[PDB]
Amino acid sequence: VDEVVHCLSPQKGQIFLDMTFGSGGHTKAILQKESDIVLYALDRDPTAYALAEHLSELYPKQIRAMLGQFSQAEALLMKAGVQPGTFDGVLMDLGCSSMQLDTPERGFSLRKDGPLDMRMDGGRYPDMPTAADVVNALDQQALASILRTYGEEKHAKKIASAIVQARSIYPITRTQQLASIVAGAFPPSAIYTRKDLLQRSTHIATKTFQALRIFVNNELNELYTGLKTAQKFLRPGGRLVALSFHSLEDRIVKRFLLGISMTERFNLSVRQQVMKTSQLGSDHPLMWELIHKKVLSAKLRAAIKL
């Protein structure tokens, strides 16, 4: 949290929005530096939200826990009486929490086997499609588009073809099952003895899992909406600090901080919204002062609102 909080520079008497409370690390680090604050602690994950509620028992004056997605943040802040132009700082750490990555039943990680779930909202929305629903239902071209667009997976076609053939034999319901199917798309001479293809990053199924995660959790639209809410509720002179972990979300943060307008779904025709993957984050007056960019496999960007 150190560098994140460092760029925030919490001062006595200030008010903060942590939009990605997660395991609580940054919010706790902020409280260690300055206890005389108010902090709204938001997460879309019930598990993280329950940790924020617990924290609010030890810090009842400061902490206000909220359960909600980035796209729900504005309504939650309005219902809590929070006015635009209020926050001295807003924090968006886009990384998966340790609870998400280290609970195999959630199905985020390539380490231990578990259900191909991958919903950040956990059990909050039982009708929300899982990664399993997606890979068992979509057709080959649609799967390939998701993997190419969201995972930047050069081998989208072959991998999507392998999923479609595999799911005809048995439904794909587990993470290691999907990882094995992905690996089976590559001839042995492509991958033999290649230890990097098993390592934490650079694992052969990494981009596939990342693409499904972004799709299942609508991460690109959510992020853009969250950024606009952060800007609206920051006061003049307040700081936005964002931590990005892959290139699509970092490009969205970057473009946002440059005041470059990007795709609102309301501007897309119904046909495009149904049949095309999002182009957010893809290649094809001043509102901010950009005060930090640093690589920590994550990229921190910090800005002061003018």
Numbering used by the authors: 8 to 291, 303 to 314, 329 to 338
Published text:
To further investigate the mechanism of m4C839 modification, we determined the structures of apo METTL15 and the binary complex METTL15–SAM. Comparison of these two structures revealed that the root-mean-square deviation (r.m.s.d.) of the Cα atom was only 0.145 Å (269 to 269 atoms). Therefore, we mainly used the METTL15–SAM complex for subsequent description. Comparison of the electrostatic potential surface of these two structures showed that the positive charge at the SAM-binding pocket of METTL15 was significantly enriched after SAM binding. The crystal structure was solved by molecular replacement using the structure of apo METTL1570–407 solved previously as the search model.
